[PDB]
Design a protein around this ligand. Sequence first.
Ligand SMILES: COc1ccccc1NC(=O)c1ccc(NC(=O)N(CCc2nc3ccccc3c(=O)[nH]2)Cc2cccs2)cc1
Ligand SMILES: [Zn+2]
Lengths: 160, 46
Amino acid sequence: GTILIDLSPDDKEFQSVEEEMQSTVREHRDGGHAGGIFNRYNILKIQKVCNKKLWERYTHRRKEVSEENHNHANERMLFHGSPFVNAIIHKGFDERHAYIGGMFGAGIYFAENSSKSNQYVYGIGGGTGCPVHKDRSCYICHRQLLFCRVTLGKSFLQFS
Amino acid sequence: AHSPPGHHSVTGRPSVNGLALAEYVIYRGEQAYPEYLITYQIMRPE
Ligand SMILES: COc1ccccc1NC(=O)c1ccc(NC(=O)N(CCc2nc3ccccc3c(=O)[nH]2)Cc2cccs2)cc1
Ligand SMILES: [Zn+2]
């Protein structure tokens, strides 16, 4: 059910997504171990993910949350990195593959910092890096992130 | 896992690294939609 629509670099929607990706890079306490050493990205492609059933699944849940929270879904746009992005875009996120070992227990994790999500593209802690060169700081291999609409509703605040 | 009772997500606020942004966890896959797929390279600092 999923189709991918390529955005033109001249499209303001491409531009605003790229700005969010670029502007939320930061340095990491691992000195680049997991995600690589970089200050910016070369954006190769930005595709809209179009799937009517997955969208309706989202908006159904969003309305449920909103109704439980004074008509406030508390919707954010956040990054997600993992080796499973190609499954996610076809089948949706599935909490049965939740990050069992995350800081906040077994759920599905998102970041404001694109560079945080980048640390997970090749696996937890960057795994062994890119499949071709086994390099977590590979500058050659193409990487993929999702930029996702996320319903937070009433969020539990964990200082950490 | 489930969200904490009376909550729909968790927000991980940074308490050490002053420059880190927040991280978030949801416990239901239906609470996120993958709007954009971004293909990229990281760039070697000049
Ligand atoms: C084949 O799988 C499927 C098949 C069919 C349908 C759906 C899917 N998959 C899923 O829905 C799914 C759901 C959850 C996860 N894992 C996670 O959330 N993590 C954390 C990875 C990460 N951590 C972060 C921490 C802080 C801030 C940002 C992030 C971030 O950006 N990413 C774990 C991983 C486990 C193995 C490699 S990484 C993965 C897929
Ligand atoms: Zn590589």
